[PDB]
Amino acid sequence: FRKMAFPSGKVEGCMVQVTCGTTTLNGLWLDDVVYCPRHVICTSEDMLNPNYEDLLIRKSNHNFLVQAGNVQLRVIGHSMQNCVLKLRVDTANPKTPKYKFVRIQPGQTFSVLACYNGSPSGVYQCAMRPNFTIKGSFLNGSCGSVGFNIDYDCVSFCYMHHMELPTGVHAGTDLEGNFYGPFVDRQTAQAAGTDTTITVNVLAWLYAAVINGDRWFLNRFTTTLNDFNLVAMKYNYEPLTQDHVDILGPLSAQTGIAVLDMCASLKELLQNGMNGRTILGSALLEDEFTPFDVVRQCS
Amino acid sequence: FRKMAFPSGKVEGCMVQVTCGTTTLNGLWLDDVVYCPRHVICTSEDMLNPNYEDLLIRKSNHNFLVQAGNVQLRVIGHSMQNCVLKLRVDTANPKTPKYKFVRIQPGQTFSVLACYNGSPSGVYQCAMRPNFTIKGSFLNGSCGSVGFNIDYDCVSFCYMHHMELPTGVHAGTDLEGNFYGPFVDRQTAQAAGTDTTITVNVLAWLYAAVINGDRWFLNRFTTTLNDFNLVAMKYNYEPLTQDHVDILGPLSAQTGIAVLDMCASLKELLQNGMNGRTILGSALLEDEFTPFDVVRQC
Ligand SMILES: COc1cccc2[nH]c(C(=O)N[C@@H](CC(C)C)C(=O)N[C@@H](C[C@@H]3CCNC3=O)C(=O)COP(=O)(O)O)cc12
Ligand SMILES: COc1cccc2[nH]c(C(=O)N[C@@H](CC(C)C)C(=O)N[C@@H](C[C@@H]3CCNC3=O)C(=O)COP(=O)(O)O)cc12
């Protein structure tokens, strides 16, 4: 069991660089539209509190340099959707995959393709925290890098990178430019809310352990969803949703362990601790594997 | 600071499916040659003690089914290099990157493109352990998946997957077909030698933790290289060479913590444990980041 990203080639073929003045960021070239963070239009001093609608009115199509590698793509239109700039270019990307734009929920994981000046640098898997932060790895010049999932050659884009909080975590938008969480694209220290443990992913990990024959923590009690949720919040664990119960279904069926029985097993772990014992080799409960992640690495 | 693999697009364009009989696995298509593990020619019976050269001479070009996506490539030749079968096809792969075949040293890292039926499934980073296994994530059908590094648009292939040991770790060959370690491509339960921890990599990772504003493990003390290595070897850590010390230079210069200062930190963490704390989110001392790995990301 390890953190595994999706193959990045279908997204690599869509990465370009977008420059305004001296500001260069990454953009996403799908069909004949390039998506990138709107603050590329900002000067260093417009950034503390920018008037983006005002800033954009001064810009023209020919103020935008879009480059696939060193090849220029002529910009023939521009609009602002929330915090993302949409640049219509004169060439449909021949490497455009089947795609959708999706807004993910806390807990869901995705692969990040870290890029600089339109050139891929690395790929790794992140989880969206309950406080709408990701624990990423980004340097200057990374903005506009995207996060994604691939389901049957269809690339679901879910994240575009904008910001590093003072705590070192990262924040950004979906591909419609709506931030995850309560952050804004300004040059300003913002703090995320207190983070919690992703309960649905911890349960998936317990299912993963059972599948591999590590099952001492199973007990003979059960619980209601509401009773579990109330206890979970006293341990800094996220409450479960009906959708969380549903995506645990496959693992529940595969192991024969009811979701609410596994919750009662987790509940006992929270009230009593590990007592010097390990699960899948570890003394800590892992919370960045989704049920889908567990199914993927077991099937 | 997280484990990050190279982007895999240049390799994805090389993965094909290879079928001989009722065995299917992955192959790597570069120019007009397809590389895959040789046991794709074996039947259930042969697997116990296969005389491979004997079994190969009895195969024809038309016994090999190579599929690239949905298109089928026609084998026009075949040979064996150690545990790797080389299948010549009549079509050159347009997506062939600039590439080299390299054999990595233990402690060095690479990216693994896990593939099933010639279709890429996931990418992650591994390190060649000192006992020549890797701690990967591979299921049935993953044989022929490859490991690689990328330096200035040149892909260096170093690993082709063959086996999962009873202990759950993994083993394979370089692209010349030579196994890493004492393993053999027969269907037997094989054990590796005792593993040790990659010391130079643990130090790099401690330097990585400092760079990211975590310092709770440092201390005022210092140690000599030999006195460090005595303690390190007692804990089944690999010895630290003067080359390792130099390789860590950049990280030492950036953080202003001398190497042998960090060694004293590691020596204390080994003698005192981690006392319930975590470093970069880990309860355990992590050894799968090389110095260059840290630098490239930091
Ligand atoms: C407001 O005072 C602060 C105080 C304390 C902490 C703070 N953090 C930020 C911030 O994050 N600012 C955004 C730009 C704003 C307009 C949203 C930014 O810097 N994003 C980077 C990615 C970053 C760079 C390093 N690691 C990353 O993740 C880009 O890539 C685009 O900027 P570049 O032109 O490429 O450098 C401001 C700030
Ligand atoms: C009694 O014998 C044993 C006892 C105890 C442990 C054992 N382990 C193996 C082994 O690993 N055997 C190789 C083939 C031999 C001939 C080298 C194999 O099974 N390789 C997999 C990838 C593997 C499969 C699961 N996870 C992976 O990483 C392929 O991909 C090709 O096989 P498939 O055609 O896909 O089934 C044999 C064995």
PDB file of N, CA, C and O in Angstrom, chain A residues 1-10 12 113-114 120-127 135-137 139 153 282 284 288 296-299, chain B residues 1-10 12 113-114 119-127 135-139 283 288 295-298:
ATOM      1  N   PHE A   1       0.814  -1.217   0.000  1.00  0.00           N
ATOM      2  CA  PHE A   1       0.000   0.000   0.000  1.00  0.00           C
ATOM      3  C   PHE A   1       0.842   1.259   0.000  1.00  0.00           C
ATOM      4  O   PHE A   1       1.552   1.534   0.959  1.00  0.00           O
ATOM      5  N   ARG A   2       0.762   2.051  -1.063  1.00  0.00           N
ATOM      6  CA  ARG A   2       1.504   3.301  -1.047  1.00  0.00           C
ATOM      7  C   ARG A   2       0.757   4.368  -1.836  1.00  0.00           C
ATOM      8  O   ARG A   2      -0.182   4.078  -2.582  1.00  0.00           O
ATOM      9  N   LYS A   3       1.190   5.613  -1.651  1.00  0.00           N
ATOM     10  CA  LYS A   3       0.578   6.738  -2.342  1.00  0.00           C
ATOM     11  C   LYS A   3       0.961   6.685  -3.813  1.00  0.00           C
ATOM     12  O   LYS A   3       2.141   6.799  -4.156  1.00  0.00           O
ATOM     13  N   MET A   4      -0.039   6.503  -4.676  1.00  0.00           N
ATOM     14  CA  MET A   4       0.140   6.300  -6.109  1.00  0.00           C
ATOM     15  C   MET A   4      -0.647   7.356  -6.878  1.00  0.00           C
ATOM     16  O   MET A   4      -1.854   7.504  -6.663  1.00  0.00           O
ATOM     17  N   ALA A   5       0.025   8.078  -7.776  1.00  0.00           N
ATOM     18  CA  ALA A   5      -0.627   9.037  -8.655  1.00  0.00           C
ATOM     19  C   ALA A   5      -1.107   8.350  -9.929  1.00  0.00           C
ATOM     20  O   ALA A   5      -0.633   7.276 -10.283  1.00  0.00           O
ATOM     21  N   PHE A   6      -2.038   8.999 -10.636  1.00  0.00           N
ATOM     22  CA  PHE A   6      -2.386   8.545 -11.979  1.00  0.00           C
ATOM     23  C   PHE A   6      -1.259   8.859 -12.959  1.00  0.00           C
ATOM     24  O   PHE A   6      -0.496   9.799 -12.754  1.00  0.00           O
ATOM     25  N   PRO A   7      -1.131   8.084 -14.041  1.00  0.00           N
ATOM     26  CA  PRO A   7      -0.179   8.461 -15.093  1.00  0.00           C
ATOM     27  C   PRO A   7      -0.512   9.862 -15.606  1.00  0.00           C
ATOM     28  O   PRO A   7      -1.682  10.212 -15.775  1.00  0.00           O
ATOM     29  N   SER A   8       0.520  10.675 -15.826  1.00  0.00           N
ATOM     30  CA  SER A   8       0.302  12.098 -16.060  1.00  0.00           C
ATOM     31  C   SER A   8       0.340  12.512 -17.536  1.00  0.00           C
ATOM     32  O   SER A   8       0.263  13.714 -17.825  1.00  0.00           O
ATOM     33  N   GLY A   9       0.417  11.561 -18.473  1.00  0.00           N
ATOM     34  CA  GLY A   9       0.653  11.926 -19.864  1.00  0.00           C
ATOM     35  C   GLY A   9      -0.492  12.693 -20.507  1.00  0.00           C
ATOM     36  O   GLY A   9      -0.264  13.578 -21.344  1.00  0.00           O
ATOM     37  N   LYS A  10      -1.739  12.346 -20.160  1.00  0.00           N
ATOM     38  CA  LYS A  10      -2.878  13.024 -20.779  1.00  0.00           C
ATOM     39  C   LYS A  10      -2.990  14.464 -20.297  1.00  0.00           C
ATOM     40  O   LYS A  10      -3.546  15.313 -21.006  1.00  0.00           O
ATOM     41  N   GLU A  12      -0.032  16.089 -19.194  1.00  0.00           N
ATOM     42  CA  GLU A  12       1.191  16.688 -19.722  1.00  0.00           C
ATOM     43  C   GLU A  12       0.948  17.335 -21.075  1.00  0.00           C
ATOM     44  O   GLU A  12       1.428  18.440 -21.340  1.00  0.00           O
ATOM     45  N   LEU A 113       0.064  17.542 -10.960  1.00  0.00           N
ATOM     46  CA  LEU A 113       1.187  17.599 -11.895  1.00  0.00           C
ATOM     47  C   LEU A 113       1.896  18.934 -11.698  1.00  0.00           C
ATOM     48  O   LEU A 113       1.499  19.952 -12.278  1.00  0.00           O
ATOM     49  N   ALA A 114       2.956  18.930 -10.890  1.00  0.00           N
ATOM     50  CA  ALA A 114       3.657  20.172 -10.578  1.00  0.00           C
ATOM     51  C   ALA A 114       4.433  20.654 -11.801  1.00  0.00           C
ATOM     52  O   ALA A 114       5.276  19.924 -12.331  1.00  0.00           O
ATOM     53  N   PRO A 120       6.132  20.170 -17.123  1.00  0.00           N
ATOM     54  CA  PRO A 120       5.934  19.272 -15.981  1.00  0.00           C
ATOM     55  C   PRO A 120       7.226  19.011 -15.221  1.00  0.00           C
ATOM     56  O   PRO A 120       8.300  18.868 -15.802  1.00  0.00           O
ATOM     57  N   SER A 121       7.107  18.941 -13.912  1.00  0.00           N
ATOM     58  CA  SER A 121       8.229  18.675 -13.025  1.00  0.00           C
ATOM     59  C   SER A 121       8.057  17.399 -12.208  1.00  0.00           C
ATOM     60  O   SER A 121       9.026  16.658 -12.009  1.00  0.00           O
ATOM     61  N   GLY A 122       6.849  17.117 -11.743  1.00  0.00           N
ATOM     62  CA  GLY A 122       6.626  15.968 -10.886  1.00  0.00           C
ATOM     63  C   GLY A 122       5.148  15.690 -10.756  1.00  0.00           C
ATOM     64  O   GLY A 122       4.309  16.556 -11.030  1.00  0.00           O
ATOM     65  N   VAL A 123       4.839  14.456 -10.336  1.00  0.00           N
ATOM     66  CA  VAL A 123       3.465  14.044 -10.084  1.00  0.00           C
ATOM     67  C   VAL A 123       3.398  13.338  -8.729  1.00  0.00           C
ATOM     68  O   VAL A 123       4.286  12.554  -8.368  1.00  0.00           O
ATOM     69  N   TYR A 124       2.365  13.659  -7.957  1.00  0.00           N
ATOM     70  CA  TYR A 124       2.162  13.052  -6.653  1.00  0.00           C
ATOM     71  C   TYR A 124       0.685  13.137  -6.314  1.00  0.00           C
ATOM     72  O   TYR A 124      -0.073  13.902  -6.916  1.00  0.00           O
ATOM     73  N   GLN A 125       0.287  12.350  -5.335  1.00  0.00           N
ATOM     74  CA  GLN A 125      -1.104  12.252  -4.940  1.00  0.00           C
ATOM     75  C   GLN A 125      -1.337  13.076  -3.675  1.00  0.00           C
ATOM     76  O   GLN A 125      -0.536  13.020  -2.737  1.00  0.00           O
ATOM     77  N   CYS A 126      -2.411  13.867  -3.673  1.00  0.00           N
ATOM     78  CA  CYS A 126      -2.806  14.710  -2.556  1.00  0.00           C
ATOM     79  C   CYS A 126      -4.201  14.317  -2.124  1.00  0.00           C
ATOM     80  O   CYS A 126      -4.964  13.739  -2.896  1.00  0.00           O
ATOM     81  N   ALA A 127      -4.541  14.695  -0.899  1.00  0.00           N
ATOM     82  CA  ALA A 127      -5.898  14.592  -0.395  1.00  0.00           C
ATOM     83  C   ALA A 127      -6.390  15.987  -0.046  1.00  0.00           C
ATOM     84  O   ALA A 127      -5.638  16.795   0.512  1.00  0.00           O
ATOM     85  N   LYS A 135      -1.952  19.201   1.272  1.00  0.00           N
ATOM     86  CA  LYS A 135      -0.560  19.173   1.728  1.00  0.00           C
ATOM     87  C   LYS A 135       0.284  18.878   0.495  1.00  0.00           C
ATOM     88  O   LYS A 135       0.581  17.729   0.177  1.00  0.00           O
ATOM     89  N   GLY A 136       0.647  19.935  -0.230  1.00  0.00           N
ATOM     90  CA  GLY A 136       1.303  19.802  -1.509  1.00  0.00           C
ATOM     91  C   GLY A 136       2.793  20.061  -1.433  1.00  0.00           C
ATOM     92  O   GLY A 136       3.396  20.140  -0.361  1.00  0.00           O
ATOM     93  N   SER A 137       3.392  20.184  -2.612  1.00  0.00           N
ATOM     94  CA  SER A 137       4.790  20.577  -2.738  1.00  0.00           C
ATOM     95  C   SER A 137       4.889  21.487  -3.952  1.00  0.00           C
ATOM     96  O   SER A 137       4.815  21.017  -5.094  1.00  0.00           O
ATOM     97  N   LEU A 139       6.679  25.351  -5.472  1.00  0.00           N
ATOM     98  CA  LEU A 139       7.600  26.469  -5.399  1.00  0.00           C
ATOM     99  C   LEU A 139       7.010  27.646  -6.174  1.00  0.00           C
ATOM    100  O   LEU A 139       5.923  27.561  -6.765  1.00  0.00           O
ATOM    101  N   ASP A 153      -9.879   6.630 -19.157  1.00  0.00           N
ATOM    102  CA  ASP A 153      -9.321   7.575 -20.128  1.00  0.00           C
ATOM    103  C   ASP A 153      -9.971   8.961 -20.111  1.00  0.00           C
ATOM    104  O   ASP A 153      -9.594   9.829 -20.913  1.00  0.00           O
ATOM    105  N   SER A 282       1.639  -0.131  11.118  1.00  0.00           N
ATOM    106  CA  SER A 282       1.784   1.238  11.586  1.00  0.00           C
ATOM    107  C   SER A 282       1.017   1.461  12.885  1.00  0.00           C
ATOM    108  O   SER A 282      -0.026   0.847  13.130  1.00  0.00           O
ATOM    109  N   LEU A 284      -0.079   4.539  13.590  1.00  0.00           N
ATOM    110  CA  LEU A 284      -0.951   5.665  13.293  1.00  0.00           C
ATOM    111  C   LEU A 284      -1.954   5.259  12.223  1.00  0.00           C
ATOM    112  O   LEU A 284      -1.645   4.472  11.329  1.00  0.00           O
ATOM    113  N   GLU A 288      -5.354   9.349   4.179  1.00  0.00           N
ATOM    114  CA  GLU A 288      -5.298   9.897   2.822  1.00  0.00           C
ATOM    115  C   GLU A 288      -5.476   8.834   1.734  1.00  0.00           C
ATOM    116  O   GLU A 288      -5.106   9.061   0.575  1.00  0.00           O
ATOM    117  N   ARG A 296      -8.500   0.253  -5.765  1.00  0.00           N
ATOM    118  CA  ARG A 296      -7.561   0.262  -6.885  1.00  0.00           C
ATOM    119  C   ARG A 296      -6.306  -0.545  -6.568  1.00  0.00           C
ATOM    120  O   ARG A 296      -5.816  -1.299  -7.418  1.00  0.00           O
ATOM    121  N   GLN A 297      -5.786  -0.427  -5.348  1.00  0.00           N
ATOM    122  CA  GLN A 297      -4.557  -1.127  -4.988  1.00  0.00           C
ATOM    123  C   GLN A 297      -4.798  -2.556  -4.521  1.00  0.00           C
ATOM    124  O   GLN A 297      -3.834  -3.259  -4.191  1.00  0.00           O
ATOM    125  N   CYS A 298      -6.049  -3.006  -4.473  1.00  0.00           N
ATOM    126  CA  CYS A 298      -6.343  -4.388  -4.139  1.00  0.00           C
ATOM    127  C   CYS A 298      -6.969  -5.163  -5.288  1.00  0.00           C
ATOM    128  O   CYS A 298      -7.146  -6.381  -5.158  1.00  0.00           O
ATOM    129  N   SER A 299      -7.293  -4.510  -6.405  1.00  0.00           N
ATOM    130  CA  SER A 299      -8.029  -5.155  -7.497  1.00  0.00           C
ATOM    131  C   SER A 299      -7.493  -4.769  -8.875  1.00  0.00           C
ATOM    132  O   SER A 299      -7.362  -3.586  -9.202  1.00  0.00           O
TER     133      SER A 299
ATOM    134  N   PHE B   1       6.862  18.898   1.249  1.00  0.00           N
ATOM    135  CA  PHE B   1       7.805  17.897   0.754  1.00  0.00           C
ATOM    136  C   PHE B   1       7.227  16.475   0.760  1.00  0.00           C
ATOM    137  O   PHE B   1       7.131  15.856   1.816  1.00  0.00           O
ATOM    138  N   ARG B   2       6.874  15.949  -0.419  1.00  0.00           N
ATOM    139  CA  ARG B   2       6.276  14.623  -0.550  1.00  0.00           C
ATOM    140  C   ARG B   2       7.043  13.795  -1.573  1.00  0.00           C
ATOM    141  O   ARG B   2       7.820  14.329  -2.369  1.00  0.00           O
ATOM    142  N   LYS B   3       6.796  12.480  -1.556  1.00  0.00           N
ATOM    143  CA  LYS B   3       7.370  11.580  -2.553  1.00  0.00           C
ATOM    144  C   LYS B   3       6.773  11.906  -3.913  1.00  0.00           C
ATOM    145  O   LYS B   3       5.562  11.769  -4.112  1.00  0.00           O
ATOM    146  N   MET B   4       7.603  12.333  -4.853  1.00  0.00           N
ATOM    147  CA  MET B   4       7.087  12.741  -6.149  1.00  0.00           C
ATOM    148  C   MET B   4       7.839  11.995  -7.235  1.00  0.00           C
ATOM    149  O   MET B   4       9.063  11.839  -7.165  1.00  0.00           O
ATOM    150  N   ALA B   5       7.089  11.478  -8.196  1.00  0.00           N
ATOM    151  CA  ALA B   5       7.634  10.737  -9.317  1.00  0.00           C
ATOM    152  C   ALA B   5       7.801  11.671 -10.499  1.00  0.00           C
ATOM    153  O   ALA B   5       7.221  12.761 -10.547  1.00  0.00           O
ATOM    154  N   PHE B   6       8.637  11.251 -11.439  1.00  0.00           N
ATOM    155  CA  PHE B   6       8.734  11.964 -12.696  1.00  0.00           C
ATOM    156  C   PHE B   6       7.408  11.868 -13.450  1.00  0.00           C
ATOM    157  O   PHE B   6       6.682  10.875 -13.317  1.00  0.00           O
ATOM    158  N   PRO B   7       7.072  12.882 -14.249  1.00  0.00           N
ATOM    159  CA  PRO B   7       5.926  12.749 -15.156  1.00  0.00           C
ATOM    160  C   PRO B   7       6.158  11.560 -16.071  1.00  0.00           C
ATOM    161  O   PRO B   7       7.282  11.322 -16.514  1.00  0.00           O
ATOM    162  N   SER B   8       5.089  10.815 -16.361  1.00  0.00           N
ATOM    163  CA  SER B   8       5.219   9.498 -16.973  1.00  0.00           C
ATOM    164  C   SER B   8       4.816   9.459 -18.445  1.00  0.00           C
ATOM    165  O   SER B   8       4.784   8.373 -19.036  1.00  0.00           O
ATOM    166  N   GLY B   9       4.529  10.609 -19.054  1.00  0.00           N
ATOM    167  CA  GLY B   9       3.991  10.602 -20.406  1.00  0.00           C
ATOM    168  C   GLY B   9       4.935  10.004 -21.433  1.00  0.00           C
ATOM    169  O   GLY B   9       4.501   9.334 -22.370  1.00  0.00           O
ATOM    170  N   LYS B  10       6.234  10.262 -21.296  1.00  0.00           N
ATOM    171  CA  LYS B  10       7.168   9.706 -22.269  1.00  0.00           C
ATOM    172  C   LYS B  10       7.217   8.183 -22.188  1.00  0.00           C
ATOM    173  O   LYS B  10       7.475   7.518 -23.200  1.00  0.00           O
ATOM    174  N   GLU B  12       4.490   6.197 -20.911  1.00  0.00           N
ATOM    175  CA  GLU B  12       3.158   5.727 -21.291  1.00  0.00           C
ATOM    176  C   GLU B  12       3.061   5.479 -22.789  1.00  0.00           C
ATOM    177  O   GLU B  12       2.410   4.528 -23.233  1.00  0.00           O
ATOM    178  N   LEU B 113       6.128   3.046 -13.347  1.00  0.00           N
ATOM    179  CA  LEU B 113       4.855   3.155 -14.053  1.00  0.00           C
ATOM    180  C   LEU B 113       4.210   1.771 -14.022  1.00  0.00           C
ATOM    181  O   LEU B 113       4.567   0.890 -14.814  1.00  0.00           O
ATOM    182  N   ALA B 114       3.288   1.576 -13.078  1.00  0.00           N
ATOM    183  CA  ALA B 114       2.534   0.331 -12.983  1.00  0.00           C
ATOM    184  C   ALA B 114       1.567   0.234 -14.152  1.00  0.00           C
ATOM    185  O   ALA B 114       0.833   1.188 -14.437  1.00  0.00           O
ATOM    186  N   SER B 119      -1.731  -1.139 -20.393  1.00  0.00           N
ATOM    187  CA  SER B 119      -2.389   0.124 -20.108  1.00  0.00           C
ATOM    188  C   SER B 119      -1.863   0.697 -18.794  1.00  0.00           C
ATOM    189  O   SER B 119      -1.981   0.031 -17.755  1.00  0.00           O
ATOM    190  N   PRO B 120      -1.268   1.899 -18.790  1.00  0.00           N
ATOM    191  CA  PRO B 120      -0.716   2.462 -17.546  1.00  0.00           C
ATOM    192  C   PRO B 120      -1.786   2.724 -16.497  1.00  0.00           C
ATOM    193  O   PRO B 120      -2.851   3.264 -16.793  1.00  0.00           O
ATOM    194  N   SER B 121      -1.475   2.361 -15.254  1.00  0.00           N
ATOM    195  CA  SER B 121      -2.414   2.452 -14.134  1.00  0.00           C
ATOM    196  C   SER B 121      -2.011   3.447 -13.047  1.00  0.00           C
ATOM    197  O   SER B 121      -2.874   4.126 -12.474  1.00  0.00           O
ATOM    198  N   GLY B 122      -0.733   3.549 -12.711  1.00  0.00           N
ATOM    199  CA  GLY B 122      -0.340   4.450 -11.647  1.00  0.00           C
ATOM    200  C   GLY B 122       1.144   4.717 -11.692  1.00  0.00           C
ATOM    201  O   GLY B 122       1.912   3.981 -12.318  1.00  0.00           O
ATOM    202  N   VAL B 123       1.554   5.778 -11.014  1.00  0.00           N
ATOM    203  CA  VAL B 123       2.963   6.131 -10.988  1.00  0.00           C
ATOM    204  C   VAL B 123       3.341   6.520  -9.565  1.00  0.00           C
ATOM    205  O   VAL B 123       2.592   7.215  -8.865  1.00  0.00           O
ATOM    206  N   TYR B 124       4.499   6.042  -9.129  1.00  0.00           N
ATOM    207  CA  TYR B 124       4.975   6.326  -7.787  1.00  0.00           C
ATOM    208  C   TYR B 124       6.476   6.111  -7.751  1.00  0.00           C
ATOM    209  O   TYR B 124       7.064   5.508  -8.649  1.00  0.00           O
ATOM    210  N   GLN B 125       7.075   6.554  -6.662  1.00  0.00           N
ATOM    211  CA  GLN B 125       8.515   6.532  -6.490  1.00  0.00           C
ATOM    212  C   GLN B 125       8.918   5.345  -5.623  1.00  0.00           C
ATOM    213  O   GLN B 125       8.252   5.032  -4.634  1.00  0.00           O
ATOM    214  N   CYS B 126      10.009   4.687  -6.009  1.00  0.00           N
ATOM    215  CA  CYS B 126      10.606   3.587  -5.264  1.00  0.00           C
ATOM    216  C   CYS B 126      12.087   3.877  -5.103  1.00  0.00           C
ATOM    217  O   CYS B 126      12.652   4.725  -5.799  1.00  0.00           O
ATOM    218  N   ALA B 127      12.720   3.166  -4.179  1.00  0.00           N
ATOM    219  CA  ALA B 127      14.169   3.172  -4.067  1.00  0.00           C
ATOM    220  C   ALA B 127      14.667   1.739  -4.115  1.00  0.00           C
ATOM    221  O   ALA B 127      14.033   0.829  -3.561  1.00  0.00           O
ATOM    222  N   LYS B 135      10.047  -1.722  -2.545  1.00  0.00           N
ATOM    223  CA  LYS B 135       8.786  -1.776  -1.817  1.00  0.00           C
ATOM    224  C   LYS B 135       7.762  -1.073  -2.699  1.00  0.00           C
ATOM    225  O   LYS B 135       7.493   0.123  -2.569  1.00  0.00           O
ATOM    226  N   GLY B 136       7.199  -1.838  -3.634  1.00  0.00           N
ATOM    227  CA  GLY B 136       6.289  -1.315  -4.616  1.00  0.00           C
ATOM    228  C   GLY B 136       4.850  -1.723  -4.357  1.00  0.00           C
ATOM    229  O   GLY B 136       4.498  -2.281  -3.315  1.00  0.00           O
ATOM    230  N   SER B 137       4.007  -1.415  -5.332  1.00  0.00           N
ATOM    231  CA  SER B 137       2.600  -1.797  -5.310  1.00  0.00           C
ATOM    232  C   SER B 137       2.302  -2.391  -6.680  1.00  0.00           C
ATOM    233  O   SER B 137       2.149  -1.655  -7.663  1.00  0.00           O
ATOM    234  N   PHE B 138       2.253  -3.720  -6.737  1.00  0.00           N
ATOM    235  CA  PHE B 138       2.087  -4.467  -7.974  1.00  0.00           C
ATOM    236  C   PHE B 138       1.137  -5.622  -7.718  1.00  0.00           C
ATOM    237  O   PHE B 138       1.250  -6.293  -6.691  1.00  0.00           O
ATOM    238  N   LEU B 139       0.223  -5.860  -8.648  1.00  0.00           N
ATOM    239  CA  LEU B 139      -0.702  -6.984  -8.610  1.00  0.00           C
ATOM    240  C   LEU B 139      -0.374  -7.965  -9.737  1.00  0.00           C
ATOM    241  O   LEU B 139       0.608  -7.794 -10.464  1.00  0.00           O
ATOM    242  N   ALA B 283       5.936   8.717  11.408  1.00  0.00           N
ATOM    243  CA  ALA B 283       6.385   8.148  12.669  1.00  0.00           C
ATOM    244  C   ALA B 283       7.719   7.422  12.555  1.00  0.00           C
ATOM    245  O   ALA B 283       8.333   7.135  13.586  1.00  0.00           O
ATOM    246  N   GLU B 288      13.784   6.679   1.583  1.00  0.00           N
ATOM    247  CA  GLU B 288      13.623   6.570   0.135  1.00  0.00           C
ATOM    248  C   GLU B 288      13.671   7.923  -0.571  1.00  0.00           C
ATOM    249  O   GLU B 288      13.101   8.064  -1.658  1.00  0.00           O
ATOM    250  N   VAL B 295      16.903  17.926  -3.267  1.00  0.00           N
ATOM    251  CA  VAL B 295      17.305  19.160  -3.934  1.00  0.00           C
ATOM    252  C   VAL B 295      16.326  19.504  -5.050  1.00  0.00           C
ATOM    253  O   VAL B 295      15.818  20.630  -5.130  1.00  0.00           O
ATOM    254  N   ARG B 296      16.038  18.531  -5.918  1.00  0.00           N
ATOM    255  CA  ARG B 296      15.169  18.777  -7.065  1.00  0.00           C
ATOM    256  C   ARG B 296      13.824  19.342  -6.633  1.00  0.00           C
ATOM    257  O   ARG B 296      13.261  20.211  -7.308  1.00  0.00           O
ATOM    258  N   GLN B 297      13.301  18.873  -5.501  1.00  0.00           N
ATOM    259  CA  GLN B 297      12.019  19.351  -5.001  1.00  0.00           C
ATOM    260  C   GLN B 297      12.138  20.633  -4.193  1.00  0.00           C
ATOM    261  O   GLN B 297      11.159  21.387  -4.100  1.00  0.00           O
ATOM    262  N   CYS B 298      13.302  20.899  -3.607  1.00  0.00           N
ATOM    263  CA  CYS B 298      13.461  22.029  -2.694  1.00  0.00           C
ATOM    264  C   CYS B 298      14.281  23.164  -3.316  1.00  0.00           C
ATOM    265  O   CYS B 298      13.830  23.842  -4.243  1.00  0.00           O
TER     266      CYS B 298
END
